[PDB]
């Protein structure tokens, strides 16, 4: 990056860009110095890129980023957790606050949940884990409240109680994950305001938890959920998260209706993680079993009838959501798609989860056929028909997105590119990985050929 940004107008991502790219001697320190000039909310999104560059790059580069993080660690305890964890995970093959015990409670709390998860390997069947999971988890209230929080929460807080009885285990595997509801009281600033005290005393689980809760009567009291995956590496899933979030912005910016829901991801380790779960949405395989209906019939059942606003509105959300996830999958080269991967929210979008196979990483065995977003003939019904009032909407939507993506391409590729350094992940295969990302954007293509490319995409999808 050539010096020669002496033209204009910095933006956080361009900064990240010069910082990663320039081979010039004075500039890296320089960007490190302008980082201070940025909204802390905006830089934070880039945390994993900052510590990755830190870990696997030049001393010039690490010394550059160094002072920003120290300034931010000092000011934000949650921030320090983040840096700590990230430093753990991204290196392989390479008021008590600002005192050594500062993150101690928190550590034990995470260590706790993770240990709970590991202990579930002996019990072969799901229901056994659950009953034992609640049995183990209940104890943990002995320790609460405390100075501990769920990094997932977009707001400062203290975790005051865990409604143990409502915890659940999702599968029977050894490394089987588990969902749990966690009550918390909200702060203005975690760092300043101190720990609260005991009272040993749909999404409406909330209502019944609160009514059944000692702290429930509170104004702050808010309920959170997390999926605690003790043996599953989330670093890739996270990268997926980063790209989803970005495309979300981009389309918001270019005023493109497309609809996707990035859900938060917490990398607690190289084998560990936590995921903010999607709520009120269901699995489509579940819908087929439970309802014993065509997807279209499910809609006609669940939201209104052909001319109801319930229906019309649901199905619009289906199309926009469907279009967005087709674009996301395409660009990101997502794989291992199937009915357990795609949800349906109560309002009728679809939501893709389990971003484990992306970019260069392909699932094994599976010799015969690619595992990928397919537009099923069952879908096409919900939309219209191949020739259908809204199927043409679907296509254009994809096109408009595909365009705006091209506009902002740099932002998107930047996230993945930086994260490649020193990674052992499967999604990275040399310089293919980036090369084919870019070619996937077709920068050189005219909107005509793009409209066509889309036509080919869709036809190519249904097979």
Swiss-Prot record:
GO biological process: inner ear development; lysosome organization; phosphatidylinositol biosynthetic process; phosphatidylinositol phosphate biosynthetic process; phosphatidylinositol-mediated signaling; receptor-mediated endocytosis; signal transduction
Reactions accelerated catalytically: a 1,2-diacyl-sn-glycero-3-phospho-(1D-myo-inositol) + ATP = a 1,2-diacyl-sn-glycero-3-phospho-(1D-myo-inositol 4-phosphate) + ADP + H(+)
Compartmental location: Endomembrane system; Mitochondrion outer membrane; Rough endoplasmic reticulum membrane; Golgi apparatus
Membrane topology label: Peripheral membrane protein
Keyword Disulfide bond among UniProt keywords: no
Region of interest (Catalytic loop), ranges: 333-341
Residue span of region Activation loop: 352-376
Cofactor: Mg(2+); Mn(2+)
Keyword Ribonucleoprotein appears in the UniProt entry: no
Molecular function terms from GO: 1-phosphatidylinositol 4-kinase activity; 14-3-3 protein binding; ATP binding
EC numbers on record: 2.7.1.67
Domain PI3K/PI4K catalytic: 202-463
Keywords: Acetylation, ATP-binding, Cytoplasm, Deafness, Disease variant, Endoplasmic reticulum, Golgi apparatus, Host-virus interaction, Kinase, Lipid metabolism, Membrane, Mitochondrion, Mitochondrion outer membrane, Non-syndromic deafness, Nucleotide-binding, Phosphoprotein, Transferase
Impact noted for substituting residue 347 to K: In DFNA87; uncertain significance; unable to rescue defective inner ear phenotype and sound stimuli response in zebrafish morphants
Region span, G-loop: 206-212
Record note on quaternary structure: Interacts with ARF1 and ARF3 in the Golgi complex, but not with ARF4, ARF5 or ARF6. Interacts with NCS1/FREQ in a calcium-independent manner. Interacts with CALN1/CABP8 and CALN2/CABP7; in a calcium-dependent manner; this interaction competes with NCS1/FREQ binding. Interacts with ACBD3. Interacts with ARMH3, YWHAB, YWHAE, YWHAG, YWHAH, YWHAQ, YWHAZ and SFN. Interacts with GGA2 (via VHS domain); the interaction is important for PI4KB location at the Golgi apparatus membrane. Interacts with ATG9A.
Described function: Phosphorylates phosphatidylinositol (PI) in the first committed step in the production of the second messenger inositol-1,4,5,-trisphosphate (PIP). May regulate Golgi disintegration/reorganization during mitosis, possibly via its phosphorylation. Involved in Golgi-to-plasma membrane trafficking. May play an important role in the inner ear development. (Microbial infection) Plays an essential role in Aichi virus RNA replication. Recruited by ACBD3 at the viral replication sites.
Protein family: Belongs to the PI3/PI4-kinase family. Type III PI4K subfamily.
UniProt name for this protein: Phosphatidylinositol 4-kinase beta
Organism: Homo sapiens (Human)
Whole-protein residues included: 130 to 798 of 816
């Amino acid at each position: 990056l050539l010096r020669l940004f002496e033209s204009k107008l910095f933006d956080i991502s361009m900064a990240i860009s010069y910082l990663y790219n320039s081979k010039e001697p004075g500039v890296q320190a320089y960007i490190g110095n302008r980082l201070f000039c940025f909204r802390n909310e905006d830089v934070d999104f880039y945390l994993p890129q900052l510590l990755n560059m830190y870990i696997h790059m030049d001393e010039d580069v690490g010394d550059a980023i160094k002072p920003y993080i120290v300034h931010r660690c000092r000011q934000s305890i949650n921030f320090s957790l983040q840096c700590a964890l990230l430093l753990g995970a991204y290196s392989s093959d390479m008021n008590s606050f600002s005192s050594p015990v500062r993150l101690a409670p928190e550590r034990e709390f995470i260590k706790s949940l993770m240990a709970i998860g590991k202990r579930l390997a002996t019990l072969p069947t799901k229901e056994q884990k659950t009953q034992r999971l609640i049995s183990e988890l209940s104890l943990l209230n002995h320790k609460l409240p405390a100075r501990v929080w769920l990094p997932t929460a977009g707001f400062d807080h203290h975790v005051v109680r865990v409604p143990h009885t409502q915890a659940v285990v999702l599968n029977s595997k050894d490394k089987a994950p588990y969902l749990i509801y966690v009550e918390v009281l909200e702060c203005e600033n975690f760092d300043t305001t101190s720990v609260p005290a005991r009272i040993p005393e749909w999404q409406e689980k909330v209502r019944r938890i609160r009514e059944g809760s000692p702290y429930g009567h509170l104004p702050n009291w808010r309920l959170l959920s997390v999926i605690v995956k003790c043996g599953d590496d989330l670093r890739q899933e996270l990268l997926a998260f980063q790209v989803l979030k970005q495309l979300q912005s981009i389309w918001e910016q270019e005023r493109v209706p497309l609809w996707i829901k990035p859900y938060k991801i917490l990398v607690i380790s190289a084998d560990s993680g936590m995921i903010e779960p999607v709520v009120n949405a269901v699995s489509i395989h579940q819908v087929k079993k439970q309802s014993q209906l065509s997807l279209l019939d499910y809609f006609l059942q669940e939201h209104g009838s052909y001319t109801t606003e319930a229906f019309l509105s649901a199905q619009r959300n289906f199309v926009q959501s469907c279009a967005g996830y087709c674009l996301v999958c395409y660009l990101l080269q997502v794989k291992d798609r199937h009915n357990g991967n795609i949800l349906l929210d109560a309002e009728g979008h679809i939501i893709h989860i389990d971003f484990g196979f992306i970019l260069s990483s392909s699932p094994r065995n599976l010799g015969f056929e690619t595992s990928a977003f397919k537009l099923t003939t069952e879908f096409v019904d919900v939309m219209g028909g191949l020739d259908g009032d809204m199927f043409n909407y679907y296509k254009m939507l994809m096109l408009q997105g595909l365009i705006a993506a091209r506009k902002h391409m740099d932002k998107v590729v930047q996230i993945v590119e930086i994260m490649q350094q020193g990674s052992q992940l499967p999604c990275f295969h040399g310089s293919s990985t980036i090369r084919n990302l870019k070619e996937r954007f077709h920068m050189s293509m005219t909107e005509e050929q793009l409209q066509l490319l889309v036509e080919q995409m869709v036809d190519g999808s249904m097979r």
